[PDB]
Design an enzyme around this catalytic site. Structure first.
Site, PDB file in Angstrom:
ATOM      1  N   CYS A  15       0.865  -1.153   0.000  1.00  0.00           N
ATOM      2  CA  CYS A  15       0.000   0.000   0.000  1.00  0.00           C
ATOM      3  C   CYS A  15       0.915   1.220   0.000  1.00  0.00           C
ATOM      4  O   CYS A  15       1.655   1.402   0.911  1.00  0.00           O
ATOM      5  CB  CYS A  15      -0.928  -0.036   1.222  1.00  0.00           C
ATOM      6  SG  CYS A  15      -2.230   1.243   1.134  1.00  0.00           S
ATOM      7  N   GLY A  16       0.861   2.024  -1.055  1.00  0.00           N
ATOM      8  CA  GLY A  16       1.677   3.226  -1.114  1.00  0.00           C
ATOM      9  C   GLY A  16       2.817   3.228  -2.118  1.00  0.00           C
ATOM     10  O   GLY A  16       3.585   4.186  -2.182  1.00  0.00           O
ATOM     11  N   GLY A  17       2.943   2.156  -2.894  1.00  0.00           N
ATOM     12  CA  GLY A  17       3.884   2.138  -3.996  1.00  0.00           C
ATOM     13  C   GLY A  17       5.311   1.775  -3.655  1.00  0.00           C
ATOM     14  O   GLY A  17       6.218   2.113  -4.426  1.00  0.00           O
ATOM     15  N   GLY A  18       5.548   1.088  -2.541  1.00  0.00           N
ATOM     16  CA  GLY A  18       6.898   0.725  -2.166  1.00  0.00           C
ATOM     17  C   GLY A  18       7.753   1.868  -1.668  1.00  0.00           C
ATOM     18  O   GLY A  18       8.937   1.655  -1.381  1.00  0.00           O
ATOM     19  N   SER A  19       7.194   3.073  -1.563  1.00  0.00           N
ATOM     20  CA  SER A  19       7.904   4.223  -1.026  1.00  0.00           C
ATOM     21  C   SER A  19       8.079   4.091   0.489  1.00  0.00           C
ATOM     22  O   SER A  19       7.474   3.238   1.145  1.00  0.00           O
ATOM     23  CB  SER A  19       7.146   5.505  -1.366  1.00  0.00           C
ATOM     24  OG  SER A  19       5.774   5.361  -1.040  1.00  0.00           O
ATOM     25  N   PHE A  20       8.931   4.947   1.050  1.00  0.00           N
ATOM     26  CA  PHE A  20       9.036   5.019   2.500  1.00  0.00           C
ATOM     27  C   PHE A  20       7.676   5.396   3.073  1.00  0.00           C
ATOM     28  O   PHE A  20       6.991   6.280   2.550  1.00  0.00           O
ATOM     29  CB  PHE A  20      10.109   6.029   2.916  1.00  0.00           C
ATOM     30  CG  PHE A  20      11.482   5.691   2.402  1.00  0.00           C
ATOM     31  CD1 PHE A  20      12.214   4.657   2.971  1.00  0.00           C
ATOM     32  CD2 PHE A  20      12.027   6.377   1.327  1.00  0.00           C
ATOM     33  CE1 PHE A  20      13.473   4.334   2.495  1.00  0.00           C
ATOM     34  CE2 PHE A  20      13.284   6.058   0.844  1.00  0.00           C
ATOM     35  CZ  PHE A  20      14.008   5.035   1.426  1.00  0.00           C
ATOM     36  N   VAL A  23       3.051   0.373   3.479  1.00  0.00           N
ATOM     37  CA  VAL A  23       2.717  -0.701   4.408  1.00  0.00           C
ATOM     38  C   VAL A  23       2.469  -1.972   3.607  1.00  0.00           C
ATOM     39  O   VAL A  23       1.723  -1.961   2.622  1.00  0.00           O
ATOM     40  CB  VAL A  23       1.498  -0.337   5.283  1.00  0.00           C
ATOM     41  CG1 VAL A  23       1.115  -1.507   6.178  1.00  0.00           C
ATOM     42  CG2 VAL A  23       1.828   0.881   6.137  1.00  0.00           C
ATOM     43  N   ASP A 126      -3.072  12.583  12.262  1.00  0.00           N
ATOM     44  CA  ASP A 126      -3.573  12.024  11.010  1.00  0.00           C
ATOM     45  C   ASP A 126      -4.632  10.941  11.250  1.00  0.00           C
ATOM     46  O   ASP A 126      -4.714   9.964  10.506  1.00  0.00           O
ATOM     47  CB  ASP A 126      -2.422  11.487  10.159  1.00  0.00           C
ATOM     48  CG  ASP A 126      -2.830  11.229   8.721  1.00  0.00           C
ATOM     49  OD1 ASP A 126      -3.802  11.864   8.249  1.00  0.00           O
ATOM     50  OD2 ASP A 126      -2.197  10.365   8.072  1.00  0.00           O
TER      51      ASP A 126
HETATM   52  C1  LIG Z   1      -3.227   1.015  -0.383  1.00  0.00           C
HETATM   53  C2  LIG Z   1      -4.100  -0.226  -0.241  1.00  0.00           C
HETATM   54  C3  LIG Z   1      -4.874  -0.134   1.080  1.00  0.00           C
HETATM   55  O1  LIG Z   1      -5.680   0.726   1.227  1.00  0.00           O
HETATM   56  N1  LIG Z   1      -4.603  -1.081   2.161  1.00  0.00           N
HETATM   57  C4  LIG Z   1      -5.343  -0.977   3.411  1.00  0.00           C
HETATM   58  C5  LIG Z   1      -6.371  -2.102   3.475  1.00  0.00           C
HETATM   59  C6  LIG Z   1      -6.001  -3.191   4.502  1.00  0.00           C
HETATM   60  O2  LIG Z   1      -5.167  -2.629   5.491  1.00  0.00           O
HETATM   61  C7  LIG Z   1      -5.154  -3.362   6.692  1.00  0.00           C
HETATM   62  N2  LIG Z   1      -5.960  -4.354   7.060  1.00  0.00           N
HETATM   63  N3  LIG Z   1      -5.610  -4.761   8.300  1.00  0.00           N
HETATM   64  C8  LIG Z   1      -4.557  -4.032   8.745  1.00  0.00           C
HETATM   65  N4  LIG Z   1      -3.865  -4.086   9.911  1.00  0.00           N
HETATM   66  C9  LIG Z   1      -2.847  -3.252  10.146  1.00  0.00           C
HETATM   67  C10 LIG Z   1      -2.477  -2.317   9.178  1.00  0.00           C
HETATM   68  C11 LIG Z   1      -1.311  -1.373   9.447  1.00  0.00           C
HETATM   69  C12 LIG Z   1      -0.218  -1.501  10.351  1.00  0.00           C
HETATM   70  N5  LIG Z   1       0.496  -0.396  10.149  1.00  0.00           N
HETATM   71  C13 LIG Z   1       1.746   0.016  10.758  1.00  0.00           C
HETATM   72  C14 LIG Z   1       2.858  -0.804  10.636  1.00  0.00           C
HETATM   73  F1  LIG Z   1       2.766  -2.006  10.000  1.00  0.00           F
HETATM   74  C15 LIG Z   1       4.070  -0.421  11.178  1.00  0.00           C
HETATM   75  C16 LIG Z   1       4.164   0.804  11.798  1.00  0.00           C
HETATM   76  C17 LIG Z   1       3.059   1.634  11.905  1.00  0.00           C
HETATM   77  N6  LIG Z   1       3.248   2.930  12.533  1.00  0.00           N
HETATM   78  S1  LIG Z   1       2.737   3.299  14.083  1.00  0.00           S
HETATM   79  O3  LIG Z   1       2.668   4.744  14.273  1.00  0.00           O
HETATM   80  O4  LIG Z   1       1.335   2.898  14.258  1.00  0.00           O
HETATM   81  C18 LIG Z   1       3.744   2.435  15.324  1.00  0.00           C
HETATM   82  C19 LIG Z   1       3.107   1.560  16.186  1.00  0.00           C
HETATM   83  C20 LIG Z   1       3.822   0.874  17.160  1.00  0.00           C
HETATM   84  C21 LIG Z   1       5.189   1.071  17.263  1.00  0.00           C
HETATM   85  C22 LIG Z   1       5.823   1.952  16.402  1.00  0.00           C
HETATM   86  C23 LIG Z   1       7.329   2.130  16.500  1.00  0.00           C
HETATM   87  C24 LIG Z   1       7.953   3.181  15.839  1.00  0.00           C
HETATM   88  C25 LIG Z   1       9.332   3.308  15.910  1.00  0.00           C
HETATM   89  C26 LIG Z   1      10.079   2.403  16.644  1.00  0.00           C
HETATM   90  C27 LIG Z   1       9.452   1.352  17.292  1.00  0.00           C
HETATM   91  C28 LIG Z   1       8.073   1.212  17.221  1.00  0.00           C
HETATM   92  C29 LIG Z   1       5.114   2.628  15.412  1.00  0.00           C
HETATM   93  C30 LIG Z   1       1.840   1.259  11.358  1.00  0.00           C
HETATM   94  F2  LIG Z   1       0.721   2.047  11.438  1.00  0.00           F
HETATM   95  N7  LIG Z   1      -0.048   0.347   9.191  1.00  0.00           N
HETATM   96  N8  LIG Z   1      -1.146  -0.252   8.777  1.00  0.00           N
HETATM   97  C31 LIG Z   1      -3.160  -2.222   7.961  1.00  0.00           C
HETATM   98  C32 LIG Z   1      -4.231  -3.123   7.757  1.00  0.00           C
END
Ligand SMILES: *CCC(=O)NCCCOc1n[nH]c2ncc(-c3cn(-c4c(F)ccc(NS(=O)(=O)c5cccc(-c6ccccc6)c5)c4F)nn3)cc12
EC number: 2.7.11.25
Length: 291
Positions: A15-20, A23, A126
């Site tokens: 999700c997001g094109g492999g960019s930084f 996910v 956000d």
């Molecule tokens: C583009 C296509 C699309 O729309 N896809 C979405 C549809 C389905 O998406 C999902 N369905 N179930 C899900 N469950 C989880 C996610 C999900 C998880 N994240 C996520 C990460 F994988 C990693 C990091 C973060 N950032 S954070 O701010 O939440 C964070 C949380 C705990 C700890 C830390 C940390 C930072 C630095 C050092 C140590 C720890 C960060 C994140 F949100 N994103 N989506 C998606 C879906």
């Protein structure tokens, strides 16, 4: 700081094109677990304290990927997808008063934990329906709560964010925790109307309507007063007039102890064929004003 190995992962989807900030849906092989993986430019020391946050309405940290120059954060993967995709599908026909109250409460308690109960104060900035995911048992989990400080790549087109952003956020002004209150109000309106916020309008038109003309999402006339009052309180242009999440939790508590609300709300919900035109007539006016 549990470390997950690149060689312990299989990646299926991005999700997001492999960019930084993208996910990935992936499999943690040694654990036989489905996981989410966010790609980061670097793991900053400040955000390591995010690794200790834990709450049933927050996405759960599993570990970090450190295989330089590749870095990532691994979390649980909520089986039923994003709140946004659920709402704008036929799956959400089942939503009723009790469903809305449980999910409103989920997000409020998650946000209250972030603001007030974790070892550090976290202001999301956000929060939106694409950032809330649904676990297998229907528990909502907030994602991306640490990006505003850390991953400035998950922050950043941005069209699909402006409807959820408080005016002070749109203006890149300094922010209190009630910016999340504003975003929460939008999520609540999505659950009540099952509509895409400001559907049809481009993001930057929304940004201008929200900041300059004090425009807000149309609340249908037959929407019960308790929900309209909470929404209006969350959407106050003045950030200090917005409730805390403790206050929202208290307000949801009062609402669930109002024996008249279930009938009012549930009759409103299955009458969408009637009030839907109110939303569509405002949208007409806003794009006509543009032209
Ligand atoms: C583009 C296509 C699309 O729309 N896809 C979405 C549809 C389905 O998406 C999902 N369905 N179930 C899900 N469950 C989880 C996610 C999900 C998880 N994240 C996520 C990460 F994988 C990693 C990091 C973060 N950032 S954070 O701010 O939440 C964070 C949380 C705990 C700890 C830390 C940390 C930072 C630095 C050092 C140590 C720890 C960060 C994140 F949100 N994103 N989506 C998606 C879906």
């Amino acid at each position: 700081f549990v470390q997950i190995k690149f060689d312990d992962l299989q990646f299926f989807e991005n999700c997001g094109g492999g960019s930084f900030g993208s996910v990935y849906r992936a499999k943690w092989i040694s654990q036989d677990k489905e996981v989410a993986v966010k790609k980061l430019l670097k793991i900053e020391k400040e955000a390591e304290i995010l690794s200790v946050l834990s709450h049933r309405n927050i996405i759960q940290f599993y570990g970090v990927i450190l295989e330089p120059p590749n870095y990532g954060i691994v979390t649980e993967y909520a089986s039923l997808g994003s709140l946004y995709d659920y709402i704008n599908s036929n799956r959400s026909e089942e939503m009723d008063m009790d469903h809305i109250m449980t999910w409103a409460t989920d997000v409020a308690k998650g946000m209250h934990y972030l603001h007030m109960e974790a070892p550090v104060k976290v202001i999301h900035r956000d929060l939106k329906s694409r950032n809330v995911v649904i676990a297998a048992d229907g528990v909502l989990k907030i994602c991306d709560f640490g990006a505003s400080r850390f991953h400035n790549h998950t922050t950043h087109s941005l069209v699909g964010t402006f409807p959820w952003m408080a005016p002070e956020v749109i203006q890149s002004l300094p922010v209190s925790e009630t910016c999340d209150t504003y975003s929460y109000g939008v999520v609540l309106w999505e659950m009540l109307t099952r509509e895409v916020p400001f559907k049809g309008l481009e993001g930057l038109q929304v940004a201008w309507l929200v900041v300059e003309k004090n425009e807000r999402l149309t609340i249908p006339s037959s929407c019960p007063r308790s929900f309209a009052e909470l929404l209006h309180q969350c959407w106050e242009a003045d950030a200090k007039k917005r409730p805390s999440f403790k206050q929202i939790i208290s307000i949801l508590e009062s609402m669930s102890n109002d024996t008249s609300l279930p009938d009012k709300c549930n009759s409103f919900l299955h009458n969408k064929a009637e009030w839907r035109c109110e939303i569509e007539a405002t949208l007409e006016r806003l794009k006509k004003l543009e032209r």
